[PDB]
């Protein structure tokens, strides 16, 4: 009935990323100080969570995308989104 979001931020500008699961697809909206724009993330999922951390000034983002009982981790480390090693307890 309602879309599901996850958000993360870094720095003091700040940079913000908001991930929205709608219709089985997760997309990404970005804020870097001058208006919201669309980011490169696009993966299947009904539910989403996110966390991020800085190494110096480089951001690292991990998005956990779930469909059914399957969760896939997606990794941003500065040069494209790549599948992570995450698997669940099951
Ligand atoms: C795709 C999808 C998601 C992501 C859902 C739900 C449903 C869902 O299937 P959908 O095709 O929408 O079928 C439904 C329809 C047509 C109606 C009228 C429903 C529900 C669903 C079931 C139950 C439902 C759900 C909710 C929430 C917050 C409410 C209020 C809520 O009651 P309400 O809106 O009165 O009743 O959780 P949420 O939307 O996050 O999860 C559960
Ligand atoms: C009107 C306007 C233009 C046409 C600019 C720039 C700025 C600008 O002023 P404004 O946007 O008000 O203030 C800024 C704000 C609020 C932020 C957060 C800025 C920048 C500016 C400065 C710096 C900046 C500029 C860039 C580019 C490509 C980047 C990535 C870029 O770093 P960004 O992460 O955005 O940081 O060049 P651009 O051709 O856009 O030139 C330079
Ligand atoms: O500048 C936008 C961008 O490169 O920021 C890092 C990640 O959020 C990417 O998905 C996104 O496209
Ligand atoms: O560099 C990617 C990676 O090693 O980063 C740390 C964890 O997110 C791992 O699952 C992931 O594969």
Residue numbers in the entry: 1 to 90
List passages from the publication reporting this PDB structure.
Here, we report protein recognition and assembly by a phosphate-containing macrocycle (pctx). We show that the C 3-symmetric phosphocavitand is a versatile receptor for N-terminal residues or arginine but not lysine. The macrocycle of interest is the recently reported phosphate derivative of C 3-symmetric cyclotrixylohydroquinoylene, dubbed pctx and produced in 3 reaction steps. , Compared with the bowl-shaped, C 4-symmetric sulfonato-calix­ ­arene (sclx 4 , a known protein receptor), the saucer-shaped pctx is smaller, shallower, less polar and less anionic. The test protein we studied is lectin (RSL, ∼30 kDa), a 6-bladed β-propeller with C 3 and pseudo C 6 symmetry.
